Design a binder for this molecule. Structure first.
Ligand SMILES: Nc1ncnc2c1ncn2[C@@H]1O[C@H](COP(=O)(O)OP(=O)(O)OP(=O)(O)O)[C@@H](O)[C@H]1O
Ligand SMILES: Nc1ncnc2c1ncn2[C@@H]1O[C@H](COP(=O)(O)OP(=O)(O)OP(=O)(O)O)[C@@H](O)[C@H]1O
Ligand SMILES: Nc1ncnc2c1ncn2[C@@H]1O[C@H](COP(=O)(O)OP(=O)(O)OP(=O)(O)O)[C@@H](O)[C@H]1O
Ligand SMILES: Nc1ncnc2c1ncn2[C@@H]1O[C@H](COP(=O)(O)OP(=O)(O)OP(=O)(O)O)[C@@H](O)[C@H]1O
Ligand SMILES: [Ca+2]
Ligand SMILES: [Ca+2]
Ligand SMILES: [Ca+2]
Ligand SMILES: [Ca+2]
Ligand SMILES: [Ca+2]
Lengths: 380, 380
């Protein structure tokens, strides 16, 4: 379409977490008003929003209320059910649509969609009962990984199978939920690419980021990713094909495995701004949040050039004390805090973007701060 | 001092215009809360702030109310009551102080401060009646400019005397208000430098901007300024001298005139983020607004590296319709709109940062858009 949502209009956001907040901040710079729906009062996004609706995500009356006061609707919360999605796409303006969301919510459906797009993933099998598990183990051998098709996050609902000794735990998981078995990919680095596509079909792709997870939570994103030119260009090419084949509108985070000998496998997709793209706030010509707003409002997209190398480091509840105490050591460090009321140990409270001409110096800065010693030790 | 205002605390801003709005957005990214005082409801800053106080700038009890709900107070309105600042610095925390602002509020007092810092100004005389105007004209000759000592913005309260024929208009101005007459400098370029100094005395200087005015309102800022490295170094050294001699805490904008022989005359000072510093939002490692917040909260200052060449173009009320209509043509352009509810011909509604590797291509982009045909017709 050529449908444009002009500055001055209201953008409605389903989900009031940090992703919503950062969307709202970028939209405010451009003169947009913001409405947000979230089940808890005073969410990070509500602190920036003009209008706040406190309600469950599955409350259709409240979704309708959000839509009826918004000129365009988007989401950070992905688990919107079909009845709400169909209503939104037909009776509100939801340029992102429902089709991509439905593919990314189920690991089996997601992998099917990626292969149909022509892109490589780990060899996988659907597991709906004990016999399918047995057949899958015999076909894919060891090592392999069993994951729940839905609801899985932070490595939960996941069993790695290294030998027959692991089968018992795998059977327990498969007893409890629909699963997929994937062949274990021996990779060197986990990487991600944020890709943007506007309503009118303009596309932009951000640089490849190298992602380091510790205890199933992202710790650092490094840009440029420390991978060969071959791996880099391949990752970017794959992300574009995905955007094109999936008919993306908005933002798509493509998480990948990169092997020593130059292969990329697509691991999973997120149809929203993503933690591995927070680096863009300080290091790129446009942030993933500014791009997201432009894409859904059908404005011309900004450029995605990396202006300075960067290390994004996540700030969890366990880190917030150390961050405030070390505040006067934060030279070259660009702090972002989400305004969450309560710190919980593993809850994401913010992040810091460490900019430097040299990635290793940025990495050394994170270390020398001694805030993430816990994460550092687990990596050692 | 070593007083630090930590993220999570409330920053109070006196003045709800676009400068406060942009301070608030940068503060919110770092997790600060915002309170604002403005005489008009729904101001640009109130649209982002957590707390809004609607009141006059002289309403002591409202200023008192703001101080009570803030951990630190800053100003945005350059024409603030004064004495109210003397209340604030003694009974609350106003790290900027009152002394610098009071000096810059009066052109005569301003000129004295600059001269006492050892820097050049246009030769000037105080004018309080017709006899003094007559004597000043005799001494300074033509061309010269008569300016009100207080209340001058957008070229208001000024009469340029090119010949004796302009004296009649100047005489009317001199009766209306206290004025200074100064020599008219035949500069090659106008430049500005934004200098930042924190509570602990850390000092950062932004790159020199080349500024183009039309009808005494800023039209374009160009960075890097198209000047010799020698003039650039001079301008920066001048800004550091002023920051130190005026004992700056916070932001200081320094407008300068550059003549063919390579000389710099200081035109005026502004103890706040400045229109000529808006380019920093998109083109520098840190924006002037993020820097200002860091300065007053006593956090380490960010780097001021220019990450890409930029042309900032002001969007006035006369331009808003054109911007919205030509919104699809804004590739390479980073739009900021301030949320002002009422448009007036010369009122500042927003700005656009045009980023490009080549400064001349950016300048050509502004022309090709034809949004500022009026400005380009008046320039040639
Ligand atoms: N096929 C595979 N081969 C090798 N390692 C894998 C495979 N699948 C998953 N992993 C490992 O398990 C980790 C988590 O799995 P996954 O990518 O499904 O994320 P998740 O469990 O949804 O958690 P998150 O919330 O971080 O996305 C990955 O980062 C990767 O290191
Ligand atoms: N239990 C859950 N299951 C699925 N999604 C969740 C859950 N809890 C929170 N979310 C969603 O996760 C998003 C925030 O993602 P976050 O930044 O924590 O990690 P991420 O962007 O998925 O990166 P990673 O892949 O490393 O986990 C929000 O959209 C939020 O609604
Ligand atoms: N996409 C999602 N699918 C399922 N549940 C979700 C999703 N997003 C959020 N939730 C639920 O909402 C809760 C809070 O959301 P989220 O995890 O994004 O914020 P948080 O700041 O991490 O809070 P907490 O640390 O309490 O989980 C989660 O614990 C989860 O139960
Ligand atoms: N002495 C001078 N010689 C030559 N040109 C001058 C002189 N004084 C002012 N000008 C021109 O007029 C413009 C506006 O002057 P000045 O900065 O004093 O106005 P102002 O209204 O106080 O500015 P602001 O809108 O920034 O508050 C200058 O940028 C310059 O172009
Ligand atoms: Ca996942
Ligand atoms: Ca996660
Ligand atoms: Ca993931
Ligand atoms: Ca002035
Ligand atoms: Ca001026």
């Amino acid at each position: 379409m050529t449908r444009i949502i002009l500055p001055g209009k209201t953008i409605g956001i389903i989900g009031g977490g940090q992703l919503g907040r950062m969307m709202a901040l970028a939209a405010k710079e451009m003169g947009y008003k913001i409405a947000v729906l979230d089940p808890t009062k005073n969410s990070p996004c509500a602190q920036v929003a003009d209008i706040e609706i406190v309600a469950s995500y599955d409350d259709l009356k409240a979704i309708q209320h959000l839509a009826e006061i918004s000129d365009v609707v988007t989401y950070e919360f992905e688990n919107i059910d079909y009845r709400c999605l169909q209503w939104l796409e037909k009776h509100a303006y939801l340029p992102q649509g429902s089709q991509l969301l439905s593919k990314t919510q189920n690991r089996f459906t997601e992998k099917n969609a990626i292969e149909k797009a022509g892109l490589p993933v780990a060899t996988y099998r659907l597991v709906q009962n004990q016999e399918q598990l047995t057949e899958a183990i015999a076909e894919l051998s060891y090592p392999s990984v069993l994951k729940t098709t839905t609801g899985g996050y932070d490595g939960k609902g996941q069993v790695v199978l290294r030998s027959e000794a692991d089968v018992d735990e795998a059977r327990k998981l498969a007893n409890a939920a629909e699963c997929i078995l994937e062949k274990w990919v021996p990779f060197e680095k986990e990487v991600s690419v944020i890709v943007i596509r506007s309503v009118s079909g303009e596309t932009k792709v951000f640089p490849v980021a190298e992602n380091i997870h510790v205890n199933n939570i992202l710790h650092e994103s490094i840009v440029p990713a420390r991978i060969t030119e071959e791996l880099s260009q391949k990752a970017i090419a794959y992300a574009k094909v995905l955007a094109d084949e999936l008919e993306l509108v908005g933002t798509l985070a493509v998480e990948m495995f990169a092997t020593a000998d130059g292969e990329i496998y697509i691991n999973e997709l997120a149809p929203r701004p993503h933690n591995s793209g927070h680096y863009t706030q300080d290091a790129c010509e446009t942030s993933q949040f500014g791009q997201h707003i432009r894409a859904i409002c059908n404005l011309p997209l900004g450029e995605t050039n990396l202006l300075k190398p960067v290390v994004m480091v996540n700030i969890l509840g366990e880190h917030i004390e150390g961050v405030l105490r070390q505040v006067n050591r934060l030279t070259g460090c660009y702090l972002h805090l989400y305004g969450k009321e309560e710190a919980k140990a593993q809850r994401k409270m913010g992040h810091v973007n460490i900019l430097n001409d040299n990635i290793e110096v940025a990495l050394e800065k994170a270390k020398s701060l001694h805030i993430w010693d816990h994460q550092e030790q687990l990596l050692e």
